[PDB]
């Protein structure tokens, strides 16, 4: 096999929390550690972890014969697209700095950076709408029939989060006691599914827990001295904590009734980058197809793509299934025996310890990687890849044309 093309859909790197709410204060007697950047911004350490991934990808793509060992990629051989958020733009630059240092590869965004880019979520600008009833029933079914069923099967992990928070000594709990009580997160903050034409979310403990366990993970990856006030001490605890974050993404972002719509512009972009065709300037002034395309997005995007293309995974050593800097990697491979075209999909990521130790990455110290398979592919090769035609058929089935740009 010979590597012809690669599209990397990446989550942004380590960032500060996006919000600092009263409820976050009320559920723990302890003080949340402060962060060195504004809310939701990439930290400098976050960018350094992304550059490690970019350096590794250069070494890997050189070894695969797609990029030259020395010099800068010439004229669009590498292209970078990023969401308008600071954290995604800065992730773009960090990846370029690791992959091709001092080559000044442009980080393209949409023209207006003060407005949402529908590429990373067409619901957000009203390009299309979700089907309310179908989404409600689909999500509730994946939760086990109800959100009460969902949280009941997860009390062990909610109890883990309460211990790390010292929830019993929190303001919320102390009040509950003066008031007949139930000092449990799930019952103090009942969770409801809210489905609108442009969004779905959970209220209450489910969404609070998804956010708090992710913050814990970000503290660890940021190198903070004692994440979770020092109360997270082994990998079992880390996995149990982030299972609440992963479960919320399983419901809200992997569900096909949400994922297929939300992922349609990215699906179109991916297919455009991977399909052989006379090179032509398309979205963002980027010429496609080309050799490497890096797209700096969000964890909803990785989850959306996973849900739409029936790609299932868990990340060994990385409690967050859609971690900072995690990469959904699409590759087009040409089989020399008959010159047929094949698509390979992988999830490339830093383990939590590689982020904790700021481990420089290389061929001899690679990031983790999980081989994926498109569950619906009818034509696979011995190595698990889907034929170009099979992948194209799968994409055309999964995408929602009303959600296209
Ligand atoms: Ni995630």
Numbering used by the authors: 6 to 410
Please give me the paper's original passages concerning this structure:
Only AppA-HDE showed an increase in stereospecificity, decreasing the production of InsP5 [1/3-OH] to only 6% of total InsP5. In addition, while AppA-HDE increased specificity towards InsP6 relative to the wild-type enzyme, it showed reduced accumulation of 1D-myo-Ins(2,3,4,5)P4, accumulating instead a novel InsP2 intermediate. On the contrary, the variant AppA-HDE becomes more stereospecific than the wild type while reducing the accumulation of the 1D-myo-Ins(2,3,4,5)P4 intermediate. At residue position 305, the T305E substitution found in the AppA-HDE and -HAE variants results in sidechain χ1 angles of 46° and 65°, respectively, for the glutamate residue. AppA-HDE has slightly enlarged pockets A and B due to the loss of the side-chain methyl group of T305, whereas the double mutant AppA-HAE has larger pockets A and B with an overall change in polarity. For both variants, pocket F decreases in size and its polarity increases by virtue of introduction of the larger sidechain of and carboxyl group of glutamate. In particular, active site comparisons suggest that an enlargement of specificity pocket B allows accommodation of multiple InsS6 binding poses (e.g., for AppA-HET), while the decrease in size of pocket F by the substitution T305E (e.g., AppA-HDE) leads to an enhancement of stereospecificity.
AppA, the Escherichia coli periplasmic phytase of clade 2 of the histidine phosphatase (HP2) family, has been well-characterized and successfully engineered for use as an animal feed supplement. HP2Ps catalyse the hydrolysis of phytate via an obligatory phosphohistidine intermediate. The catalytic proton donor is found in a second, short, conserved motif with sequence HD positioned such that the aspartic acid residue functions as the consensus proton donor in the catalytic mechanism.
